[PDB]
Amino acid sequence: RKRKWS
């Protein structure tokens, strides 16, 4: 799992 910051 990777995660973007909006």
Add this chain to the structure above:
Amino acid sequence: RQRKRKWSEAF
């Protein structure tokens, strides 16, 4: 059938 199954053995 007698033995333990780890996550990858079952799924």
Add this chain to the structure above:
Amino acid sequence: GTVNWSVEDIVKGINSNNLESQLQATQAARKLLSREKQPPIDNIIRAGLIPKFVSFLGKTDCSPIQFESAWALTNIASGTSEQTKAVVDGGAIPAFISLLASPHAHISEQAVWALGNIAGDGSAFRDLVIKHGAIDPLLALLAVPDLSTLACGYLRNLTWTLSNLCRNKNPAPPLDAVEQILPTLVRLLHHNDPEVLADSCWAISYLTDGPNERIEMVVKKGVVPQLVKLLGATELPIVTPALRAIGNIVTGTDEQTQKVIDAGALAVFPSLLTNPKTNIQKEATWTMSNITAGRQDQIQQVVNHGLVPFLVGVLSKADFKTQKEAAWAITNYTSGGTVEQIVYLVHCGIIEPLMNLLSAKDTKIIQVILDAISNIFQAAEKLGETEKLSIMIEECGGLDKIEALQRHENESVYKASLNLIEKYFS
């Protein structure tokens, strides 16, 4: 101001010899890389902007450009493996580890976020993050008397990054890295935030998925009662990894499996085995199958908790995957059970649902069910009650299914079905 800039304008601003122009262009790149629909990540990489962003991470004198370049790089690192490799190849790992000690909590959090995305890519990047020394400064950010004083989002990001350092196999994380993280992980498992609890459980589920030596490291920390408590939580994002962790521990030794039973885990299974989420039901039945693969006294605890009618239930009606796991639980139970325990399984009505599943187009399940039939017949042989069981299988149309399996494509099915017909139905 810094909204909807072209890549060309971002490059022109970053290549200027003006720190403020570079800051405005870096913020513009961050906003571009933050948009919901198709961020131009590959366009930013092709423009050669990753080495510029990495150098901006070191500008201690300008904290806003550190934040903007950390955020821009986190958006790239959160992309594909190739996009994460581009961040790593630009030398971002040591630059992000240096930002963990930043006096600006928003910059430090961005570095935590970036390292989580890099470690999360796989085994090699996880171990590279560890080799560059990220664990000590990450653990120091959680070295506080009470976790409740930390900002909620900051703690959630730290927990998530630590779980990615516990994640993946081939190889599993280094033993000493696991030993270092575990005391902080045990602490996060007793925290009150549901997201922190979910990610702490996922971390424990990754650490318990492997050889029994890996399970022992975790079980030795006394987390099993806390995992059982979280197994009874109302939040599905907590129950899913908590059940995965409990399921992984019962794949271990009889002694490790006993720690799960002693903590009162079996009392949660009437609801888990009837859970509306099919994956909970499937993994709960997989967990049951490994417990029925245990000692006769462990099989007895399954009986005492009234869980055999719940196994008859999932075998009778569930998604096929859960039914296949129920078949396993029955075969394991009949393999290691006493005559009295096997007799009890029949009195709970296991025969009819077991026979109905011989119609499945799955070779493995058929072999599993046929072995259980044989096992049950062996217990009936010890009591001279083989005729009573033969009539039972005949009456529910089980004989018609076994006789038809005497012409099955698979060799093991063919031989096992011919054996039962010749021994108890001829």
